[PDB]
Write a protein that binds this ligand. Sequence first.
Ligand SMILES: Cc1cn([C@H]2C[C@H](O)[C@@H](COP(=O)(O)OP(=O)(O)O)O2)c(=O)[nH]c1=O
Ligand SMILES: Cc1cn([C@H]2C[C@H](O)[C@@H](COP(=O)(O)OP(=O)(O)O)O2)c(=O)[nH]c1=O
Ligand SMILES: [Cl-]
Lengths: 419, 419
Amino acid sequence: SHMRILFATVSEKSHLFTMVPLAWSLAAAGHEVHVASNPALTASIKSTGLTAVPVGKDHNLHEMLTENRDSLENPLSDWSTPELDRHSWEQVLMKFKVSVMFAYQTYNDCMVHELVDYARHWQPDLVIWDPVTYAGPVAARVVGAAHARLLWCIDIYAKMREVFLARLAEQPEERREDPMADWLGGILGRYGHTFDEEVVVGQWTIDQIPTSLQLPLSLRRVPVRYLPHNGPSEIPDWLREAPGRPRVVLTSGVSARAALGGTFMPVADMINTLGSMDIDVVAALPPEEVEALEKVPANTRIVDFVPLHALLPGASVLIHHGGFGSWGTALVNGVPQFIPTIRYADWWNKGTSLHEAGAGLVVHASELTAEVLRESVERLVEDASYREAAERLREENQRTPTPHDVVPVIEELTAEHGR
Amino acid sequence: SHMRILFATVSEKSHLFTMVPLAWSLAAAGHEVHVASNPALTASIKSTGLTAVPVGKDHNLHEMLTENRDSLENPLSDWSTPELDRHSWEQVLMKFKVSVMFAYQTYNDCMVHELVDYARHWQPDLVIWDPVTYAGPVAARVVGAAHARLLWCIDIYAKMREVFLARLAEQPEERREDPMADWLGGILGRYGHTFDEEVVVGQWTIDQIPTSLQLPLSLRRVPVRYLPHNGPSEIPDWLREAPGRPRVVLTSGVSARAALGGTFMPVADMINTLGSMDIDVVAALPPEEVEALEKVPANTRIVDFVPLHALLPGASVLIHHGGFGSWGTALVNGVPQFIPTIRYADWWNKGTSLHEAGAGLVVHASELTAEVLRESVERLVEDASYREAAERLREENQRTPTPHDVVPVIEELTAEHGR
Ligand SMILES: Cc1cn([C@H]2C[C@H](O)[C@@H](COP(=O)(O)OP(=O)(O)O)O2)c(=O)[nH]c1=O
Ligand SMILES: Cc1cn([C@H]2C[C@H](O)[C@@H](COP(=O)(O)OP(=O)(O)O)O2)c(=O)[nH]c1=O
Ligand SMILES: [Cl-]
């Protein structure tokens, strides 16, 4: 029966879009769904069809990374390998110290008290939070609401948390320390609530990553099928013409651009390299990257934006940085992926999971050259094992319960864990 | 199993928004949903979260009615009473002749061939059409797709069609004539398909009107719960403060404004009348109407837009023209409605149905005065029978299957019909 459901996300369009199909599935079952983020995300929430709740104030954070011109990858923010074998106690502690200090706090502290305040007014039965939107579980706990993470990610966050807690138990009492406990327990303490480990990983985890590609973890885990949502979308007229040869799709973005930096292969050189091959190229590039081009190859169409969910059917290859929208839309379409990227968020893991399943190829961005690009693209087109592997991953996605199918499960888990 | 579903609507934002929760329920179950209309609706479709398909060219039609300053109500377009006892053969024939000529053709002929063309490319298994988007069934029939109307309306359209066909059967063979058959049979004939009566009323009808309020008809009818969709929505800060006294909401619009005309009680006079009562007034007014105001009463807050789904919980009254979004959002909130309107579309019937259930009051717009307004508002607040009736209609809506619940039903009706 009838629920108030508060979705919470950091002010990233790309994260928001991963949450939209689940939000709509719950709304279509008659529940009230509101989505809360900083004011900067208000317009993006509004164009998803869902009701926006602006909370708190904006952070400086995406005004920072775009006047950066410089890579985000950093040994301390590389969580691509969350194993005990690569993390002494002091290395894991440090990784939490920097990530809490220089990411989670900037993302959440601007809006956490205003979110708690909104939850107090609205009394959601359930909070569903993006995996780094730790303001979400804090707000839920303060009102006794159930809460769950909704994953766009290979779950490096929970796995590194497993590595952390294992090394925490090995230390003597007088040098136990937990940056997540201090920070979030601090905020919860202000409201007369205690910290608990379900505030870091949720009461359960709704997971859009195919099981065969996800890290094994001690979680209550609800698999859900990834349904492409690529933001505001129209079908262009030129999409009717089947290509006559393999279509190769390339996506840069203002977020991809801001993370990879300007030291790696220029996107002009990538277009020139693809422009020499017997392929149909569609490249989606931000406007500043569009004028860095001298000449547009005869085989190439440049666009601002084109919805991948409509373009990728019968595409042969997608080249991207390992963002989820791109990764997922290719996956459900059975398209081999080439992912030249960095150890930021789970992007490396997005690449390496496909590389190891034989469905795509990953390469570090600093090793990308005209010849590596040319040969990777040719292999993914020519060698049928890539398409065949990708097709099997597609089939795994299509066997996963839809958002529609997991609504009852979310309803019961809420009765169980709610107040 | 997996479907391509084409929604089709005339270029009215208000009609589109009625279709959005159903569209999202189908997408949440893994199906592909595209929404087609003229280019003018593209931006509105895009901010519903759904994929837009621009077809055909725009019509002059809503650029006409807004430089009109003149009522739309007309004995030939008054379909509020589709009974045999009020329609000789020649009166029904005439009503179809004018409505096809001066409404349906203007709405649909601008885009029908381009829609057929898109359906031919995309091969939808299913077309769901707004009830006056007759371009939709034409496109479906040409590709053998199943199709259904999705009703925002008390079904005057199918009922007047029943009255028409009954009078058609009574005429001798040399004076049979059907304006719907000529028009839509003409278009279908150009493609090598015949006319059929399921092109006028759909193969089945998905109906968002509570059954107790809907005209009984010879239709395959799927009841579905109305879930409020009011267009792009954010929660304002000022909504947290409970009112201390009965909240009365008033909605004019650029469509309400364009239909009622300039001869009935000015909205300035309505604000002044409510401004003298012990109530909390929220009025949502178009910008033209905002400067026609001299002074804003102390009990009154004026806004451009405020999502009714968020404002109407524990409101006491909604005053409006009987558009469905307003009518439905009040209904699900158990708010008594005052509907000063005209016999355009089903607006009279929207008012009528509530008036006869004792849940609200209707009055023709030409009879509206300061005293009628004042007394209707006072009765709807003070006489508890209105709220109690409204609550029962709410309860009926909440017992109707959600879009989520009716997805399997739409799936098997699709397997059954067309290919
Ligand atoms: C650039 C671009 C993005 N997208 C989608 C993919 C994702 O759902 C979303 C953005 O996520 P992501 O893949 O991380 O890229 P970006 O750098 O553009 O933020 O937009 C398209 O569908 N088409 C495009 O042309
Ligand atoms: C003006 C206004 C409309 N609405 C919604 C109600 C409907 O879902 C939708 C359209 O309203 P409707 O009464 O049909 O008016 P119009 O034809 O001018 O668009 O907008 C609000 O929620 N709040 C407002 O302030
Ligand atoms: Cl006052």
